[PDB]
């Protein structure tokens, strides 16, 4: 009854042969999926649930169809290869906070991330490579208290209680992204979550279009018609005219298949959320 393809996930990140399971590993297959398979809410702006977080529907859709996906589906599916690979995983869940007010009401737990536990090395790491444009681009130690580098910026673990809050330096301010608890998480809990997330008519996946990559030089963050591009010394913006233009970003520059979307009139829905 099957077997996990762990060659086909190695290929679709542009890599190949078979890693130790070591802390070498883990930092090169984060930042290969980190440039290959794109953050993107294409099913529930469509109206497509994202309900099944089995390894066989993640490898259907991110791997074999080149599409992307979000967050539970991205540590959806590294958490299954990194477990192939001899890595023992646990997935955790978080609440965004990035950007919220100060009094803001508690937000639902709709974020997964992954604690790691990695042969010969102490301790377990986060690893995240589904929170979009400002996800981690590499393995982090889950201790609280110091600040880690990273591929890219700086982030840290803070502790209050069980609660963990994870922030990056931002260009040069720390901010906030998510706090999260460190007891694992089974299927059957993430898969509600990500019902809520893609079916509540409130969700900011619901709402409107994000699309995300992350290169070695930079982040890329589309939301709606507004494309925002993190570099090494400059931000570029580009504000697209309309979903015509977006639609070929989402094809051209971000590498997603439409064609596995045949039928839904995907233009005419991104024509709908330019602006939210």
Same mark, same amino acid.
């Given at each position: 009854?099957?077997?996990?393809?762990?060659?086909?996930?190695?290929?679709?990140?542009?890599?190949?042969?078979?890693?130790?399971?070591?802390?070498?590993?883990?930092?090169?297959?984060?930042?290969?999926?980190?440039?290959?398979?794109?953050?993107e809410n294409l099913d529930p702006l469509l109206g497509i649930?994202?309900?099944?977080?089995?390894?066989?529907?993640?490898?259907?859709?991110?791997?074999?169809?080149?599409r992307?996906?979000?967050?539970?589906?991205?540590?959806?599916?590294?958490?299954?290869?990194?477990?192939?690979?001899?890595?023992?995983?646990?997935?955790?869940?978080?609440?965004?906070?990035?950007?919220?007010?100060?009094?803001?009401?508690?937000?639902?737990?709709?974020?997964?991330?992954?604690?790691?536990?990695?042969?010969?090395?102490?301790?377990?790491?986060?690893?995240?490579?589904?929170?979009?444009?400002? &996800? *981690?681009?590499?393995?982090? +130690?889950? !201790?609280?208290? @110091?600040?880690?580098?990273?591929?890219? =910026? /700086?982030?840290?673990?803070?502790?209050?209680?069980?609660?963990? &809050? *994870?922030?990056?330096?931002? +260009?040069? !301010?720390?901010? @906030?992204?998510?706090?999260?608890?460190? =007891? /694992?998480?089974?299927?059957?809990?993430?898969?509600?979550?990500?019902?809520?997330?893609?079916?509540?008519?409130?969700?900011?996946?619901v709402t409107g279009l994000?699309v995300?990559?992350?290169?070695?030089?930079?982040?890329?963050?589309?939301?709606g018609r507004?494309?925002?591009?993190?570099?090494?010394?400059?931000?570029?913006?580009?504000?697209f005219?309309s979903a015509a233009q977006v639609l070929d970003a989402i094809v051209?520059?971000?590498?997603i298949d439409l064609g596995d979307l045949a039928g839904r009139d995907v233009q005419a829905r991104v024509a709908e959320v330019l602006?939210t």
């Amino acid at each position: 009854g099957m077997a996990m393809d762990l060659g086909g996930y190695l290929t679709r990140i542009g890599l190949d042969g078979r890693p130790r399971p070591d802390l070498g590993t883990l930092h090169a297959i984060v930042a290969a999926h980190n440039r290959s398979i794109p953050f993107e809410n294409l099913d529930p702006l469509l109206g497509i649930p994202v309900a099944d977080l089995s390894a066989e529907a993640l490898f259907a859709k991110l791997v074999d169809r080149r599409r992307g996906g979000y967050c539970y589906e991205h540590n959806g599916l590294l958490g299954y290869v990194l477990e192939e690979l001899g890595f023992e995983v646990e997935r955790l869940s978080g609440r965004v906070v990035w950007m919220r007010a100060d009094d803001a009401p508690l937000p639902a737990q709709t974020h997964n991330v992954l604690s790691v536990a990695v042969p010969g090395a102490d301790g377990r790491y986060l690893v995240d490579v589904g929170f979009g444009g400002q &996800t *981690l681009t590499s393995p982090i +130690r889950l !201790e609280a208290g @110091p600040v880690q580098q990273t591929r890219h =910026e /700086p982030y840290r673990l803070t502790r209050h209680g069980d609660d963990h &809050t *994870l922030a990056a330096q931002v +260009r040069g !301010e720390w901010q @906030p992204l998510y706090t999260f608890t460190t =007891e /694992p998480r089974p299927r059957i809990d993430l898969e509600v979550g990500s019902w809520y997330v893609s079916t509540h008519p409130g969700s900011h996946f619901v709402t409107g279009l994000t699309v995300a990559v992350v290169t070695d030089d930079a982040r890329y963050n589309l939301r709606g018609r507004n494309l925002a591009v993190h570099r090494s010394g400059a931000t570029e913006h580009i504000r697209f005219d309309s979903a015509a233009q977006v639609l070929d970003a989402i094809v051209n520059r971000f590498g997603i298949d439409l064609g596995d979307l045949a039928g839904r009139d995907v233009q005419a829905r991104v024509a709908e959320v330019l602006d939210t």
